[PDB]
Amino acid sequence: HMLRWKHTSSLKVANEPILAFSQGSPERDALQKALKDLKGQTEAIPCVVGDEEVWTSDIQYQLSPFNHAHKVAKFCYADKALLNRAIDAALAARKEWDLKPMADRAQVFLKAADMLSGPRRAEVLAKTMVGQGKTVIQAEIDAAAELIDFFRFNAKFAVELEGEQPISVPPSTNHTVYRGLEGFVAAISPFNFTAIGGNLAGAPALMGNVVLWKPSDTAMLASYAVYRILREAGLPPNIIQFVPADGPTFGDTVTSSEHLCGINFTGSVPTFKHLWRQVAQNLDRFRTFPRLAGECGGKNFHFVHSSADVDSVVSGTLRSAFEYGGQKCSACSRLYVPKSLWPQIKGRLLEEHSRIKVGDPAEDFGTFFSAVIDAKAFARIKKWLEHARSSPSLSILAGGQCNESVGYYVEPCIIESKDPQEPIMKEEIFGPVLTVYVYPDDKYRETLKLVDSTTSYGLTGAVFAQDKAIVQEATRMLRNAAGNFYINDKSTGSVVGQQPFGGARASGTNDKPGGPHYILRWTSPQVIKETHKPLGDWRYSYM
Amino acid sequence: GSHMLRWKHTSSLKVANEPILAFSQGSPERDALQKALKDLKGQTEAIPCVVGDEEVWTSDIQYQLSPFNHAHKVAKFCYADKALLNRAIDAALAARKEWDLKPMADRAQVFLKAADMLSGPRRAEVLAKTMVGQGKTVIQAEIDAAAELIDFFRFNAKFAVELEGEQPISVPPSTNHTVYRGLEGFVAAISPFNFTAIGGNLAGAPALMGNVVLWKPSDTAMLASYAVYRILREAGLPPNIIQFVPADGPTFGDTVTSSEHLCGINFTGSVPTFKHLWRQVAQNLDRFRTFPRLAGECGGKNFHFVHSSADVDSVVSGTLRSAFEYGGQKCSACSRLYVPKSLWPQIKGRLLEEHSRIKVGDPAEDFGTFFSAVIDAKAFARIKKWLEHARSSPSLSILAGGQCNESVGYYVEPCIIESKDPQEPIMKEEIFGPVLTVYVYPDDKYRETLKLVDSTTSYGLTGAVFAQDKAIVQEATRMLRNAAGNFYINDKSTGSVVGQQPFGGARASGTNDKPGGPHYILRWTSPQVIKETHKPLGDWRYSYMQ
Ligand code: PRO
Ligand code: PRO
Ligand code: PRO
Ligand code: PRO
Ligand code: PRO
Ligand code: PRO
Ligand code: PRO
C-alpha cells in the first residue's frame, strides 16, 4: 500500500436566511450605520498581486449611480506588464494550493461565508447599494444571500465530489484526484451582481485553480470588499489576483499567455465570442485546451394564459421587469397577454406603475428601484425609448422619462407592441423597459411558438396559468426557450441549490452555477491505479 | 396548490464489468470465435451509408484492407457527399425532439439490450471483425470490442439513469426539478481506428443523453464499426438518431461546422485535426444557434518511470505489454522507458531475452501471435521513417528489432531503442507503432529525471511509476501530477477499465472529459431547471419599504 486515501467526510449546509429589515431590527440598524460609513467616502482601491498593492497611472473612478458626483472608489487599470507579472506570481503559487486537501480550501470559503453572514453583512450590502445602485432587498439577496450560498454550497459540492470514486477490484486500488486546471483562469465579472464576481473567481479557486480576477469597473467597491474578506478568511497570496483592467487589454493579455487554462465570463455575447475567437487564433501556444464558460444574457418572457391569476401576473411582472432597473440577465422584457385579460392587466399595470418610487436607495427605503448603472447604460436605454417613440408598431403606455442631471435615472417604462417580432422584442436592453404583446385567445398555441422562435436567447421564462393541460403543453413547447423555466412565478430570483442558473441558445454555455455540476468545469481529474501484486508474464494463456 | 407538473420516481441500475473470457482450448468462446473468423475469410462486406433506415451509396467507393493480409478487402464502403451529410443532418434534427422527450430509462434500455447482444450472441462476430479488419489479436479484440464497449453501454446507462436522481432543493411555496435535456442541434462523432469500443461510445453516449448524431467511423475500422451500428439498431435505436456516415475527414468537418445546428463534436484522433475543427467552429461562431461543445481525446507520449526499488520482472512484463500490444497503436502505449543505472544490466538483459520470444504474425491463423501488422500503409511508412531515424541519429541505438516488411501485411517487428539524449525527438513525438525508447539515468539524478519525465513532451495522457519505496512513490506522484491523467503505480500504462480507471488526460492530450467515469455524460446534456410555485405571489412591494 504505497498510497493511502483518507476517508472523505460530508458537509451539511442550508441557504442563508433573507432578512426582512423591519423597523428596530438589528440588521436595519447595522445597514443604516454602514450606509452612513460610506457617505462622502472614496476608497482608493489598488490592484493586488500577491500581497502587493499596485498602482498604475491609469486612474479610474467608480461613481454612485444615483449621485454620480459621489466618486465611491478610485482605482486603476492593470497594464499588460502588470497582468503578466500577476500571471507569473499566480502560477508559482498554484501547485501548493492545488495539493491542499479539498476540505482545507473549502474552509476558506466557509469562513468567508460566515463573515459575510455576520460581521461583514452590512458592509457588503451598503457597498453594493451605494456603488451599484441597489435597494436594500436587492443588495441583501445578492451580496449577502447569493454570495454566501455560492460559498457554502460550492464548498459542499466540492467536498462531496471527492466521495465520487471508481470501483476497485483486487489486486488494485483506484482513486480519482480532482486536480485543478494546470495554468491560470481568467475571471471576468459583471456589474450587476456582487455575488457573480465572488463565484466566477471563487469557484475555480475552490477547485485548486489560480485566478486573475478582472472585476467590473462599476462594481469595484463591493468587489474589493469581497476580495478582502476572502484574504482575511485565509486565502493565500497569489491564488486570486485582483486586477481591474481595460476589457480589451485584459482579454488580449490573458489569451496571449501559453498558461491560460480557462475563462470564466459573464457579460455580452459579442465579448464572449471575441474571447472565444482569440483563444482559437492562439490555440497553438497554449499548453492545454482552455475551457471557456460564458453567461451571456437573455430576452426573457412572461407568457400569460387566460386562466392565469391576474394579481400574480401583475406583481411578478412588475418585479421581474423593474427590480434593479431591469438590469438582470433574467429580467422579464417581453410579456405576452391574451386579449381577454388585457383590460385587467393593462389597468393594473398602469395603476401600479404610477406608484413606483424611483429615487435614492440609501436615503429612501421606500424606493422600488434606483438609477441605472452608468452613462453608457443610460445612453443605450434612452436609444430604445427613442425607438419606441419612433416605431409605428410601438406605443409607450407609461413612463419613458429619464434624467441624468444628478443620477442615471430612468423611469420604469411599459410599451405595447403590435408586432410580436419588433426589434424591441428581440434585443436585450438591460433597463426598466417592458414590452407587451397582446395575442388573440384562440391563437395561444401559435403565440407559444412565437415565444420560442422570436429571439436568439434561451435564458429565463415564465408561464402563468391555472390549467394543468395548458401548463403541460407550454412546458413541452418551451423546453429550449428557457434554461430557468417558471410556472406561476417571476422569471428572476434564482436561488443557489434550488434553481441552478443558466441557459443555452445565445445565452451561453449553460454550466449551471448554483448547482452541483458547475465545479466540474474547473477540475481536470486524474485517476491513480495502484496494483499491489507483481505483474504476471507478458504472454497470455490462450497463446 | 395542486402540482400541475408531476415527476416520475427515479430508478437505479446495478451493473458490473463484463468478464474477460479466456479462449482456452475446449471453451465455447474459442469455438465461436474460430467460426466467426472463418465466416470472414475471403469475404468483402458492402457497407452503405445509413440515413434513417435508408441505405445510401455514393460514387466515392473506398475499401478497408486486412492489415496482416492487405490483399483481403474486408469491406467496400463509400464516403458520404456533402449533400448526403446535409440530408442526414436535416433528418436527424426532425427526429430529435421525440427522442429527447423519451424517458432516460427507455433510451438506456437500447444500450443495455445492445450490451447483452454483444456479450452473448454477437460477441464472436464483433471480435472477429475487429481482428480481421483492425489486425487485433484475440485478447486485444476481447478487451475492446466486447468488454470495453459492453462496459461503456452498461455503465453509461447506469450513470444516466441515476443522474436523473440529482435534483435541487425545494422550499415552500415551490417545487424545483432539473430536466436533463439533450443538446439542441446535432452532435458530430468522429472515431479512430484503434478501438472498436471508442466509436460505439463517441456516438452512443451523446445518443443516450437525448442527442442525435452523425457518426463518421474510421475507414480502417469500418467492418467492426458497422457491426456495432447494426446491433444498436436491432436493440431498438430509432431511425435518424445515429446516422452512419463514413466520409472524407476534411469534407465531414467542413460540412458539420457549416451547419447552424451543430451543438457538439465528440472527437478522438490527432491533435492537428482537433485543433482544425476547433478553429472551424470559431470561424463560424456567428451562425450557430448555440455555442458548440468540443470534446477531444488526442493521444500521448506515455512513460514508464522505474525507480531502483522496482520489481524487475513487473517492469519487464508490464513494459513489453504496454509498448507492444496491438503494435503500440494505443493512445496509452508506453513509448518512453526511464531506467536507473543500477537496474539497467538486469532490465536490459531481460528485455532483450523476452524480445526474442515475441511472435509477430497472423492473429486469425495463429493464436500464439503476440501482435500483428500495423493498421495501414500510412502508419507503416511513418514507423519506417522513425526506424531509419534511429539508425542515423548519433544519440540513438537500436537494441532489438528494427525490421519491417509490407509485402503481405504491414508488418513491423517490435523495436527497442536506447537514447543518450532524454530530449531526442523520438522521446517527444507520438509514433503509434511498436517502438520503445529507453533512457538510462544515474540513480542519484532520479529527482531531476522526474522533472524531465514531466517537461519533455507536450502530452499528459498515461504514465507509470515502478517502485516499492513509499516515500519515493509519494514524491513521484506529486511531481507527475499533471504528466498523466491516468497514472499507474506498479502497473502498465495501458488497459484502463470502464468504471475503474476513467480515461483521459490534459496538456496536448485533449479536453479530459473522462469517458469511463460518471461525469462524461454531463458534456452531452444542457440542463433546464423548472420551478413551479403553488401559492399566489402577493404584492410587488416589500415590508421594509413601508
Ligand atoms: O462503490 C464503490 O465501490 C466505489 C468506492 C466507493 C465509492 N464508489
Ligand atoms: O497545439 C498544441 O500542440 C497545444 C496543445 C493544446 C493546445 N496547444
Ligand atoms: O452599457 C455599458 O456598455 C456599460 C458596461 C457595463 C455597465 N454599462
Ligand atoms: O435569477 C436571477 O435573477 C439571477 C441572474 C443571474 C443569476 N441569477
Ligand atoms: O453569434 C451568435 O449570436 C450566436 C450565439 C451562439 C453562437 N452564435
Ligand atoms: O497514419 C495515418 O495517417 C493513418 C490514419 C489512421 C490510421 N493510419
Ligand atoms: O487505456 C487504454 O489502453 C485504452 C486506450 C483508449 C481508452 N483506453
Amino acid occupying residue B248? D
Per the structure block, which three cell numbers stand in for A198? Answer: 465572488
Give the residue among B211, B300, B227, B205 at the shortest CA–CA distance from B75. B227
Q: SS in 3 state form for B92-124?
A: HHHHHHHHHHCCHHHHHHHHHHHHHHHHCCCHH
Answer yes or no: do A528 and B488 touch at CB < 8 A: yes
Question: Which helix (H) or strand (E) covers residue B282, if one does?
Answer: helix B271-283
Per the structure block, which three cell numbers stand in for A257? Answer: 499567455
Cβ of A485 under 8 Å from any chain B Cβ? yes
Cβ of A210 under 8 Å from any chain B Cβ? no
Residue B366 CA to residue B369 CA, distance in Å, equals 6
Sign for the pseudo-dihedral over CA of A471, A473, A479, A481: negative
Which residue in chain B is spatially nearest to A506 when comparing CA positions?
B290
- Does the C-beta of A492 come closer than 6 Å to ligand 4? yes
Residue B150 CA to residue B140 CA, distance in Å, equals 14
Cis status, amide bond into A26, omega within 30 of 0: no
Per the structure block, which three cell numbers stand in for B168? Answer: 435541487
- Which ligand is closest in space to the CA of residue A8? 1
Which atom of ligand 4 approaches the CA of A499 most closely? Answer: 1
Query: What Å resolution does this PDB entry report?
Result: 1.2
Give the residue among B504, B281, B277 at the shortest CA–CA distance from A523. B504
Amino acid occupying residue B453? V
Answer yes or no: do A499 and B529 touch at CB < 8 A: yes
Residue B440 CA to residue B448 CA, distance in Å, equals 13
- Which ligand is closest in space to the CA of residue B381? 6
Residue A295 CA to residue A273 CA, distance in Å, equals 11
Amino acid occupying residue B405? N
| A20, A288, A541: residue with CB nearest B544 | A20
Per the structure block, which three cell numbers stand in for B482? Answer: 499533471
Q: What residue ranges line ligand 5, CB within 6 angstroms? A: A 269, 273, 456, 506; B 285-286, 288, 290-291
**Span between the terminal Cα atoms of chain B, in Å:** 29
Which residue in chain A is spatially nearest to B23 when comparing CA positions?
A542
Residue B421 CA to residue A326 CA, distance in Å, equals 64
Contact B508, B459 (CB under 8 A): yes
- In angstroms, the separation between the Cα of residue B524 and the nearest Cα of chain A is 12
Q: What angle do CA A19, A21, A27 make, to 5 degrees?
A: 80
Per the structure block, which three cell numbers stand in for A126? Answer: 451598503
Contact A168, A38 (CB under 8 A): no
Residue B164 CA to residue B153 CA, distance in Å, equals 17
Sequence-ordered alpha helix ranges (H) in B325-376: 344-355
- Chain A window 488-507: which residues touch B at a Cβ cutoff of 8 Å? 488-490, 494-495, 497-501, 503-506
Contact A54, A112 (CB under 8 A): no
Q: Which residues of A are annotated as a binding site?
A: 189, 214, 267-271, 428, 494
Residue A121 CA to residue A104 CA, distance in Å, equals 24
Give the residue among A134, A150, A142, A149 at the shortest CA–CA distance from A38. A134
Per the structure block, which three cell numbers stand in for A387? Answer: 425607438
**Span between the terminal Cα atoms of chain A, in Å:** 33
Per the structure block, which three cell numbers stand in for B285? Answer: 461562431
Q: Tell how far CA A329 is from the center of its chain.
A: 8
Give the residue among B244, B231, B48 at the shortest CA–CA distance from B123. B231
The domains located in chain A, with CATH, are: 1-296+496-543 (3.40.605.10), 297-495 (3.40.309.10)
Integer-rounded Cα radius of gyration of chain A: 25
- In angstroms, the separation between the Cα of residue B508 and the nearest Cα of chain A is 5
Catalytic residues of B: 297, 331
Between A and B, how many residue pairs show a Cβ–Cβ distance under 8 A? Answer: 286
Task: State residue B243 phi and psi, 5-degree precision.
Answer: -95, 130
A295 is catalytic: yes
Q: Which residues of A are annotated as a binding site for substrate?
A: 494
Last residue before each break in chain B (C–N > 2.5 Å): none
Q: Tell how far CA B105 is from the center of its chain.
A: 25
Spatial CB neighbours of A320, under 8 Å, sequence gap ≥ 6: A300, A302, A330, A331, A332, A462, A490, A491, A492
| B178, B369, B539: residue with CB nearest A315 | B539
| CA–CA distances in Å: residue B305 to residues A61, A384, B337, B344, B465 | 56, 65, 6, 13, 5
A96 is catalytic: no
Q: How many A from CA of B120 to the centre of ligand 4?
A: 51
